[PDB]
C-alpha cells in the first residue's frame with residue numbers, strides 16, 4: 001500500500017462554499033457557472049501502480065484525469081479550459097496546479113476526519129467543497 005490510500009474510493013459532494021465566486025475569478029461564463037454550480041458530483045479516486053485516476057461524475061457530465069505525481073499532463077477541465085496540470089503529494093495533501101493563458105489555479109485535496117476536503121484557489125478567492133464516502 002501507500003499513503004495515497006486514504007484518498008481511494010467513491011466520494012459524494014456534501015457541501016460547497018464560494019464556488020460561484022471561484023468560478024467567476026477563473027473566468028467561467030454565466031450559463032456554465034449556473035449548471036456547474038447545481039451539480040452534485042461524485043469523486044472516484046483509484047490508484048494502479050504509480051498512476052492515480054480522479055473521476056468527477058454527475059448526470060450532466062463526467063470527467064477523468066490519470067496522472068503520475070510530479071509529471072505534467074494535459075487536461076481539459078469541466079468548463080472546457082485546455083490547461084497544463086501538475087499534481088504532487090505534499091505533506092499528505094494532493095496539490096493540483098492548472099496553468100492556462102498565463103493564469104494559474106490550485107486545487108488542494110485533503111483528508112480531514114471522515115471527509116475529503118477540496119479547496120480551490122484563484123487570486124484571493126477560495127472555494128471549499130466537502131465530500132464524504134458514498
Ligand SMILES: CCOC(=O)c1c(NC(=O)C2=C(C(=O)O)CCC2)sc2c1CCCC2
Nearest residue numbers: 036039041056058060061078079118120129
Ligand atoms: C471550475 C469549473 O468547474 C465546472 O465547470 C464543473 C465542476 N467543477 C468541480 O466540481 C470542481 C471541483 C470539485 O469539487 O471536484 C474542484 C474545482 C472544480 S463539476 C461539474 C462542472 C461542470 C459540468 C457539471 C459538473
